Design an enzyme around this catalytic site. Structure first.
Site, mmCIF file in Angstrom:
data_model
loop_
_atom_site.group_PDB
_atom_site.id
_atom_site.type_symbol
_atom_site.label_atom_id
_atom_site.label_comp_id
_atom_site.label_asym_id
_atom_site.label_seq_id
_atom_site.Cartn_x
_atom_site.Cartn_y
_atom_site.Cartn_z
ATOM 1 N N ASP A 1 91.391 20.268 58.875
ATOM 2 C CA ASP A 1 92.138 20.027 57.308
ATOM 3 C C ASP A 1 92.564 21.377 57.033
ATOM 4 O OD1 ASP A 1 93.457 19.051 55.385
ATOM 5 O OD2 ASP A 1 91.328 18.601 54.358
ATOM 6 N N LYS B 1 80.679 20.479 44.133
ATOM 7 C CA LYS B 1 81.107 19.120 44.210
ATOM 8 C C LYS B 1 80.172 18.098 43.773
ATOM 9 C CE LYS B 1 84.903 19.654 47.094
ATOM 10 N NZ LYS B 1 85.628 18.666 48.136
#
Ligand SMILES: Cc1ncoc1-c1cccc(Nc2nccc(N(CCCO)c3cccc4[nH]ncc34)n2)c1
Length: 266
Positions: A127, A35
């Site tokens: 999540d 990322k």
């Protein structure tokens, strides 16, 4: 902290910005997923989330959780993970519709083993969705995306958020939505939604509904229906995961038992 000179990035952006790369370890190269954030013109909150993810993932060690290689501070800010190369489970099942029941059960059982470990470690994921299950192979799943995760306080079994933020509400338990309280049993509710997604070959849950309409549906005792062709025992386990009262909902130790394909004792 990692050495930029030992990292090679491929240019293709996947889906922070995401690239595949190769990181040279002490002997072998390891394939990584990275990322990437800009150094100056970044969003400080988004960077704070990935620093928080790194802080959590440095404390975890389990075969069903993505492993972090490290952070690289160079032309960009980079969070480097071991790559699970088949990618997100929802996308995989959308593109591979002949994956057998036994194979889907194997994968969601692996997720339940990672989550039983997380629960024992007293972290909440917050999540847990099929998009955050990454496949190493078609027979090996790992949990990812610890950006919202929290280490529980020693004296409580839940994390209390100040109020509702921008959340994946269709995966959240009622106590999360109504009282902002997140426990491992809240992650079990999310796991039930993840199971529904997996047996619906990556369809989105509560299709066409607003978050407020989902809350009202759930409070009335209504639940998503059984996916076409889903094994009855797996739909029954989804409904147990979707127990409204957090005290009567199972924890991951109980859920993981119900996804085993061999005889056992409790
Ligand atoms: C389709 C897609 N969109 C974003 O990434 C992908 C993708 C595609 C193929 C393989 C992977 N594999 C992978 N494996 C490990 C980590 C990882 N990522 C990228 C985001 C995946 O949702 C990460 C990099 C940095 C921190 C991270 N935390 N959790 C995952 C992850 N991706 C992805």
């Amino acid at each position: 902290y990692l050495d930029r000179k030992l990292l090679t990035l491929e240019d293709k952006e996947l889906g922070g910005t995401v690239k595949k790369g190769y990181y040279q370890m002490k002997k072998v190269v390891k394939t990584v997923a990275v990322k990437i954030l800009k150094n100056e013109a970044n969003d400080p909150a988004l960077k704070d989330e990935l620093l928080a993810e790194a802080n959590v993932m440095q404390q975890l060690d389990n075969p069903y959780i993505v492993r972090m290689i490290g952070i690289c501070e160079a032309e960009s800010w980079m969070l480097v993970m071991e790559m699970a190369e088949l990618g997100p489970l929802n996308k995989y099942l959308q593109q591979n519709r002949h994956v057998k029941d036994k194979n889907i059960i194997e994968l969601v059982h692996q997720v339940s083993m990672g989550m039983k470990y997380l629960e024992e470690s007293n972290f909440v994921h917050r999540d847990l969705a099929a998009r955050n299950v990454l496949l190493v192979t078609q027979h090996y799943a790992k949990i990812s995306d610890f950006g919202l995760s929290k280490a529980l306080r020693a004296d409580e079994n839940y994390y209390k958020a100040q109020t509702h933020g921008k959340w994946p509400v269709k995966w959240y338990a009622p106590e999360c939505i109504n009282y902002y309280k997140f426990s491992s049993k809240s992650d079990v509710w999310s796991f039930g939604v993840l199971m529904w997604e997996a047996f619906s070959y990556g369809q989105k849950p509560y299709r066409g509904m607003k978050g407020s309409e989902v809350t009202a549906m759930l409070e009335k005792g209504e639940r998503m229906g059984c996916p076409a062709g889903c094994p009855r025992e797996m739909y029954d386990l989804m409904n147990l995961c979707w127990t409204y009262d957090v005290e009567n909902r199972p924890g991951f130790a109980a859920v993981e038992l119900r996804l085993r394909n061999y005889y056992y004792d409790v």
